[PDB]
Design a binder for this molecule. Structure first.
Ligand SMILES: CC(C)(COP(=O)(O)OP(=O)(O)OC[C@H]1O[C@@H](n2cnc3c(N)ncnc32)[C@H](O)[C@@H]1OP(=O)(O)O)[C@@H](O)C(=O)NCCC(=O)NCCS
Lengths: 166, 166
């Protein structure tokens, strides 16, 4: 997959990417909702290596050629419905890179891959996540209570969707 | 070669081109798949001087008058079969310049030089390179496993070709 957006591009991982990924995958605040939790350096290398059946795609600032996060994008229901997500370096929080990248991924999915539907989920506590989802045109279709086991707790989930027709 | 395309021209090197070439030949991301790896300033000067006679030809943006890369074009098998390649400045990637220049070179080779065949090679990992090959009409004819010695490592190679009839 290769997508060119306005300030950024989305491409497949290269091994050298791991260092920039580790800047945020080692961050307990960034990784708060990821079930695997924070990554060691070895974890981040294995993550990058596994995604070179790729489901995660780095987001690169064009010009500076700096890795600012990654897009999660994979089959969800048949081959017609995919799931999208993202993890970004909090350094760039105010720049709106997530919404740009996510929107460009929706465009690719619908226009180029001819998908029917794309979904995303997040915890109700993850305000920045569902705010991006809303900004790129996704609708909240579900609010599932105590549905996800996370350690010794059950977490809730908002479920968002967007159709190709939208 | 003097070749005019839509947005660019290809000509032979002048010595003062070396500084613009050095901008990318000193870049280790640019020269990752190039056997030499990164050039020193003396390496770039030597390269430009050697190709003033010529197997490498700068690509100049018309109007802006900016050297954005070079085309590799030289005899491969007798005088009837040539090899083509390309090395460009990352500031100008993903605008279609390499493909535009390489398309124009093929046309010159077949129409004006009356060549029979033109080939190109690259590593399978070098996605933009084989995408140029495909875009300009070349066919993948080979996939050679562990054939290229790079240090004490062995790389794979894709082999592409295009014929006069195509
Ligand atoms: C190969 C090179 C000359 C291409 O230059 P360029 O002007 O960006 O090439 P173009 O814009 O004409 O085409 C590049 C194609 O690759 C695609 N591309 C670029 N990066 C990509 C990536 N990481 N993954 C998938 N596709 C990619 C582009 O989308 C484009 O295809 P498209 O037009 O169908 O979308 C340039 O990347 C380069 O100089 N590389 C370093 C030197 C090198 O390795 N030379 C080749 C040795 S064989």
């Amino acid at each position: 997959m290769f997508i060119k957006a306005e300030r950024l591009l989305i491409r497949k991982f290269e091994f050298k990417d791991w260092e920039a990924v580790h800047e945020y995958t080692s961050d307990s605040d960034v990784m708060k909702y990821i079930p695997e939790g924070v990554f060691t350096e070895e974890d981040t290398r294995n993550f990058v290596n596994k995604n070179m059946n790729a489901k995660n795609f780095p987001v690169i600032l064009i010009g500076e050629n700096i890795l600012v996060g990654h897009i999660v994008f994979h089959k969800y229901f048949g081959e017609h419905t995919y799931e999208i997500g993202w993890v970004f370096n909090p350094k760039y929080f105010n720049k709106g890179y997530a919404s740009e990248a996510a929107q460009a991924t929706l465009k690719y999915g619908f226009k180029e891959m001819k998908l029917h539907r794309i979904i995303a989920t997040c915890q109700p506590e993850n305000t920045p996540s569902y705010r991006v989802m809303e900004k790129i045109g996704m609708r909240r279709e579900g609010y599932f209570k105590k549905c996800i086991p996370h350690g010794n707790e059950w977490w809730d989930e908002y479920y968002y969707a967007i159709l190709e027709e939208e």
